[PDB]
Amino acid sequence: GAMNSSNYAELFNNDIKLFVDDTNVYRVTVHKTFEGNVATKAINGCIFTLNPKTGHLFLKIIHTSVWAGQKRLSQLAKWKTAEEVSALVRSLPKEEQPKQIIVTRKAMLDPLEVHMLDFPNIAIRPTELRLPFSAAMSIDKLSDVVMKATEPQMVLFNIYDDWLDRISSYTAFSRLTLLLRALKTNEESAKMILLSDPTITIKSYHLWPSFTDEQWITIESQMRDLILTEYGRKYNV
């Protein structure tokens, strides 16, 4: 069934699974035309496919050329997501294929189930959680590779950096979701927090700064203040 608060620790067991987020697959800018009408211009997107246990991220870059000459692009985007996820699974050795795929938005369920009919033993599940994966394009190195791409491309990351050397998957995922929630609620503040200290750098092969254990505690606290604050600034409390 659905993934929710009550079966949360299932993400961190030894059954391979992946999250699939499609919120950045079809991205547009809306502008006025010379005639004074409105039109959209697509920009490159990405499928966000993440193993929450290992941190492995399969970032498929959706180049704008995908949409050329196509109609109903928001509906297509969900199938295109599903086509790419199924192609990924098919490309992995059997012992690496997921046993479950959890979609962040219910509208991906039918597109993915249809594309995965060849895999009856892979459960396709929704979730009741409001996960902040849409903010992945607030991670500079991810946004950069997406916007620079001149063709379809798959790029591999570990979104946990080397965190698992020191913390459990459960704690890595909780840190990730806090960072992403912060970035989604107030990107400017969030990014200020992460960089304010020029001495803490980001390794060329990492996405986030090389914080110590103690510095992560401080950072994590600062991001929770931000999220609570923006909740007051938004709701006036």
Partner: protein, 300 residues
Amino acid sequence: MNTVPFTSAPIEVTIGIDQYSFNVKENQPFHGIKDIPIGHVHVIHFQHADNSSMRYGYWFDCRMGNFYIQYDPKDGLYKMMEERDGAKFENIVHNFKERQMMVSYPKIDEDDTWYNLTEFVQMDKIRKIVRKDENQFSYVDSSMTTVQENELSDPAHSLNYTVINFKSREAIRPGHEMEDFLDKSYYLNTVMLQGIFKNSSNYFGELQFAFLNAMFFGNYGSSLQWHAMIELICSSATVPKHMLDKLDEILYYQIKTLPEQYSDILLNERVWNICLYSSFQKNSLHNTEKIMENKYPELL
């Protein structure tokens, strides 16, 4: 005109013959039904006064044999049987007819309702859905499950309707996933019509038989199959023009005949709203949309 004579009526029962029904009291002098129109299938069905649980009945065609009803006090139901001695059957029918112990199939000359509900239903196809090949008539009841239901437990007592599943390899061509799911023409025209049913008449036959088993027996898997076969047509962008026109007439008479107080269970809100208002064929079912809006505007 043909006749279904009865050995007797030992238990109080509501008897139905097609869209009509009448009450027989316990041990009332009742010896069957006469003036049944030749040329159609028919169904004779039962609901005991003591246990409205289990509606049951018998699909039959008088052109295929001489059939009678005789109550079985061991199994506790009215059973259809065949009399192979034609002379003995005629004499027994003639005796009951002279003693006026039979009720008359109450058909008004101007009423084509039963024809319209059964236009494409053929006894030979019924007998393949309801497998019991030693008899020329077919037993159905409320509780019989369908083959598709059984996949999701006795196979001999199943309804072998054609399985229809929109999220199946049969329904979806590799590489046309989005195309074939959002437009089921491939699945309707190539897989089902050309492949399985062979023609639209056989398709409509099963569609009409499913509806009638849902209406007369409250057979839930039949209702599922009726809706699915409607939805497969409505969800196909490319349907022969003759099929759309006939579907509209088919469904019109089904909706017209449905008991008003059974619409809440027998009609699937989602399928009807999608079919009438969202699907490719939302403009193609004018008679059906008009009777549905005037009779069941709630459902919509």
